[PDB]
Design a protein around this nucleic acid. Structure first.
Lengths: 153, 49, 51, 737
RNA sequence: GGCCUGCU
RNA sequence: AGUAGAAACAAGGCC
């Protein structure tokens, strides 16, 4: 939660205030229409360059987007595909693999390392549960066909 | 209009983003922002019932 | 010229044959969604009317 | 802010909440169109049967408070009874007219902007000029045309995207504009709408109407320019026809296209003419386009085209150069050359003499749908690069280049009956006959040219005899390319001579043009082609009697202008105006005469009033014996084809128009002399020779009341200024004497 | 008698 | 009766 100036309180839970001033504005998981509407609105008000593809979140203090992905393949190939996909990228890119490997552009991880550790713990626990179940290999070998959609009428 | 989000959710999201951008640079002030945000919160509460 | 009883002779099964010959070497889903129309028209029931 | 309050109030209830929550955004269209009332199968019957009832109209609830229950008499204007499935209340047309006569006012100054296409249409129609009507068979061919006068060259989807971005910046969605032209037009529109108070939907609809291009299948014959197709119903008939010149954006593109097609047609017709030079000169001097004469545009617009250049040279004006070949325009860029006057045989064994040229030389081919660059030597081709658009364009360019090379590989390929004589029994140019023979198909020229090796430099593509690129072996000297434009646009217009049969030549002795180069394609003009020719004066038509009369008074203006002032009775009683008077009807000769003589007399009386057009117009009507009268005229009838052509006293007409730009006078579509500038021409806005006993002080003013009419002016008296509507719907101020 | 409909 | 022509109107529904 940003405040009057460029800083955040980064509370743990249940600490609201009259000066909400949310530090992040989620873009992912809003529906394509609403996501693009908000992206165009913020780009117009700020006057930045609209990303060709839908980003994940947005930075208000710095006025740039952020892209976050989860990969089962090699991390470097996914990161470079993300970077080249984002033409004239003015938006930070962040990648979180299950094994814990992390990367970004310029290594400008503008986030609290405690959040990074929390997400790492969440991913590690998810990996533990998947390994106990046994679908982890299927997930690893099934990422290739997830992007493409085939009609099944 | 295209999209698959319920009408109330779309209306509330649009209202929230509009208020946010107005407050960031526009006419909307802190009092009106708080009032509209709390109204949207109670609208969401009524929806979720 | 002019054809007589045009509607009373275009059997929908011929339309299904045409639709299957048109859609050769096409994805199965497209073939099915196109073929469903003659299949439904071949079994149509004509509601009589006001009486 | 109130939006969310209304949303809360709406969701407070159960059914509204249920519909709000269950329905998604996609189902909004279905819910909007959800209605029980079905469409009218016979709208006309329902409308005729509905206006008989009371309250056949539905209006918003605001009528309840915006319009009284009853008007002065007591006729109900609205009823509280609600509509079937809406909150709209029922009102009667009395309500609509009550609004029109008593409703709240408003400033409609922005209405012309929102509906700019329709007002531009009216603007074009108001400034348009008409001409004579011709009865003649029309070959109404059916083709696709453009009905939108100002289409912005955008597809329907692209136009919709542009509208959404301009009017709804946030709702544009994922789409991002790509073409720079789209961005430029978007910026142009955005700058001019930085502050517009009308609703966004109306702006979006206007932009959609004035950007999307529309095409319809019409039986058009002559025109096809979007400005002309707009008035197709007025200039095209089963048997009749008319010349129309829309008063709008005389775009240089349309004018030059019309000029090019007219040049093509005139050259084609002159080719068969017995005396092409004289006939071409007279016809060029006897035709116009879009209301403007051919000579004016020709001397004004520089446009490169074989026929256009032929017309330019024919007039004796400055003429272009850069010789052409097979419809293509060649510009030498290196080397000398000399002819040799030699003899050879063909593959079909026919013997022939030709002139083969010397020296190595490079050339810059140009054309309508292609382009090329060539290097060659004496009888031998060295290299050829081509830049055509379609494959057959490259084939045409290649066969033209092969013919130009004069190689024996081409000479030993000619097979069949190729006779070098024209329809007129005129021996034909050999080169054009070969080039026409090899345009059906040049298969033998391809299998007989030869083969060489290539270095595979630049990754260049190989040649095709019959669409077979060969990337290691290929035709000798010939290359494959695709440039955007020729080297450069030439820089020199030359002098020339012409034979009787229109064989243009240069100062040295080489050949420059001929009636065989006129491409041949039969295009469609954009602006109407006023091809005046058969359209004539028989042996002595009005284009004769009348048109000529005005020409005589033009030529003798120098002594008529001074006889008009001193001893004018000896000018009216003149032996030259007698054929004219036979056309004026016998009943209205003396009335016209008294009218016109009083006009001229009070035009002499007051100083500072002199218009040569009025004197040149109204003299043939003052010939007759004078009968006095008290009335007034807006026009003057003359019997031309049992039909009364009306000549307007004030202003121009289709029968009498003086252009103020090129100073030509025009009778009935026929020129009748250039008119000269008298220095005593009163440029004071006053016109003393339009009304009988009244002057014209200028334009209208709202002080002296509404616009009186011509036939209700005797009510006035001494010194009584007033307003009058006359002419083509123009109001003016007048003053009695 | 009253209400409602004049393509349901 | 009348309109009309392969079936209808020449008033219908409810309290």
């Amino acid at each position: 939660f940003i405040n009057e100036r460029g800083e955040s309180i980064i509370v743990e839970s249940g600490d609201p205030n009259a000066l909400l001033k949310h530090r992040f504005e989620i873009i992912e998981g809003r529906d394509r229409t609403m996501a693009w509407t908000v992206v165009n609105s913020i780009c117009n008000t700020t006057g930045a360059e609209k990303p060709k593809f839908l980003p994940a979140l947005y930075d208000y203090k710095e006025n740039r987007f952020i892209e976050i992905g989860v990969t089962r393949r090699e991390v470097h190939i996914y990161y470079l595909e993300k970077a080249n996909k984002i033409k004239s990228e003015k938006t930070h890119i962040h990648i979180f693999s299950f094994t814990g490997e992390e990367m970004a552009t310029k290594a400008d991880y503008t986030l609290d390392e405690e959040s990074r550790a929390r997400i790492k713990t969440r991913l590690f626990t998810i990996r533990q549960e998947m390994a106990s179940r046994g679908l982890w290999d299927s997930f690893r070998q099934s990422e290739r066909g997830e992007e493409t959609i085939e009609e099944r009428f | 209009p295209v999209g698959i989000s319920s009408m109330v959710e779309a209306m509330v999201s649009r209202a929230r983003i509009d208020a946010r951008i107005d407050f960031e640079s526009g006419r909307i002030k802190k009092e009106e922002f708080a009032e509209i945000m709390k109204i949207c919160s109670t609208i969401e509460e009524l929806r979720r019932q | 010229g002019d054809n007589t009883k045009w509607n009373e002779n275009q059997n929908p099964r011929m339309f299904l044959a045409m639709i299957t010959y048109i859609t050769r070497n096409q994805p199965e889903w497209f073939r099915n969604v196109l073929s469903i129309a003659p299949i439904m028209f071949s079994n149509k029931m004509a509601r009589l009317g006001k009486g | 802010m109130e939006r969310i309050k209304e949303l809360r109030d709406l969701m407070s209830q159960s059914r509204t909440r249920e519909i709000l929550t269950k329905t998604t955004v996609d189902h909004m269209a279905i819910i909007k169109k959800y209605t029980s009332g079905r469409q009218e199968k016979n709208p006309a019957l329902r409308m005729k049967w509905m206006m008989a009832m009371k309250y056949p109209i539905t209006a918003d609830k605001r009528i309840m408070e915006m319009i009284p229950e009853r008007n002065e008499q007591g006729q109900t204007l609205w009823s509280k009874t609600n509509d079937a499935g809406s909150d709209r209340v029922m009102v009667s047309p009395l309500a609509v007219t009550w609004w029109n006569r008593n409703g709240p006012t408003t400033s409609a100054v922005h209405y012309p902007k929102i509906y700019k296409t329709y007002f531009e249409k009216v603007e074009r129609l108001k400034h348009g000029t008409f001409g004579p009507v011709h009865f003649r068979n029309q070959v109404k061919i059916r083709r696709r045309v453009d009905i939108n006068p100002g289409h912005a060259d955008l597809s329907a989807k692209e136009a919709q995207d542009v509208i959404m971005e301009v009017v709804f910046p946030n709702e544009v969605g994922a789409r991002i504009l790509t073409s720079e032209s789209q961005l430029t037009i978007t910026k142009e529109k955005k700058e001019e709408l930085q502050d517009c108070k009308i609703s966004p939907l109306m702006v979006a609809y206007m932009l959609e109407r004035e950007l999307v291009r529309k095409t319809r299948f019409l039986p058009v014959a002559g025109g096809t320019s979007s400005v002309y197709i707009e008035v197709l119903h007025l200039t095209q008939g089963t048997c009749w026809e008319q010349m129309y010149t829309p008063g709008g954006e005389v775009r240089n593109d349309d004018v030059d296209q019309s000029l090019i097609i007219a040049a093509r047609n005139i050259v084609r017709r002159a080719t068969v003419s017995a005396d092409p030079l004289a006939s071409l000169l007279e016809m060029c001097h006897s035709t116009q386009i879009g209301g403007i004469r051919m000579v004016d545009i020709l001397r004004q617009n520089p446009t490169e085209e074989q026929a256009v250049d032929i017309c330019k040279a024919a007039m004796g004006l400055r003429i272009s150069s850069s010789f052409s070949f097979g419809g293509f325009t060649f510009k030498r860029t290196s080397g000398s050359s000399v002819k040799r006057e030699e003899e050879v045989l063909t593959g079909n064994l026919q013997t022939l003499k030709i002139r083969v040229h010397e020296g190595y030389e490079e050339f810059t081919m140009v054309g309508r749908r292609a382009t090329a660059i060539l290097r060659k030597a004496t009888r031998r081709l060295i290299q050829l690069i081509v830049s055509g658009r379609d494959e057959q364009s490259i084939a045409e360019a290649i066969i033209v280049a092969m013919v130009f090379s004069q190689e024996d590989c081409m000479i030993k390929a000619v097979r069949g009956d190729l006779n070098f004589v024209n329809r007129a029994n005129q021996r034909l140019n050999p080169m054009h006959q070969l080039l026409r023979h090899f345009q059906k198909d040049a298969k033998v020229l391809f299998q007989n040219w030869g083969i060489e090796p290539i270095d595979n430099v630049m990754g260049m593509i190989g040649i095709l005899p019959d669409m077979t690129p060969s990337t290691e072996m290929s035709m000798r000297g010939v290359r494959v390319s695709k440039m955007g434009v020729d080297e450069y646009s030439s820089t020199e217009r030359v002098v020339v001579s012409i034979d009787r049969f229109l064989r243009v030549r240069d100062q040295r002795g080489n050949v420059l043009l001929s009636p065989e180069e006129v491409s041949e394609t039969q295009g469609t003009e954009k602006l109407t082609i006023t091809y005046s020719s058969s359209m004539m004066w028989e042996v002595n038509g009005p284009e004769s009697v009348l048109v000529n009369t005005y020409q005589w008074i033009i030529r003798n203006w120098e002594t008529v202008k001074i006889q008009w002032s001193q001893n004018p009775t000896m000018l009216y009683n003149k032996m030259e105006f007698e054929p004219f008077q036979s056309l004026v009807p016998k009943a209205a000769r003396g009335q016209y005469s008294g009218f016109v003589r009083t006009l001229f007399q009070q035009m002499r009386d007051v100083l500072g009033t002199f218009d040569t057009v009025q004197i040149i117009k109204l003299l043939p009507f003052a010939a007759a014996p004078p009968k006095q009268s008290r009335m007034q005229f807006s026009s003057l009838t003359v019997n031309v084809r049992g039909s009364g052509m009306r000549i307007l006293v004030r202003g121009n007409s289709p029968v009498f128009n003086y252009n103020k730009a090129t100073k030509r006078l025009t009778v009935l579509g026929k020129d009748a002399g250039a008119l000269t500038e008298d220095p005593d021409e009163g440029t004071a806005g006053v016109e003393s020779a339009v009304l009988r006993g009244f002057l014209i002080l200028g334009k209208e003013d709202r002080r002296y009341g509404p616009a009186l009419s011509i036939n209700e002016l005797s009510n006035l008296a001494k010194g009584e200024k007033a307003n009058v509507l006359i002419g083509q719907g123009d109001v003016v101020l007048v003053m009695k004497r």
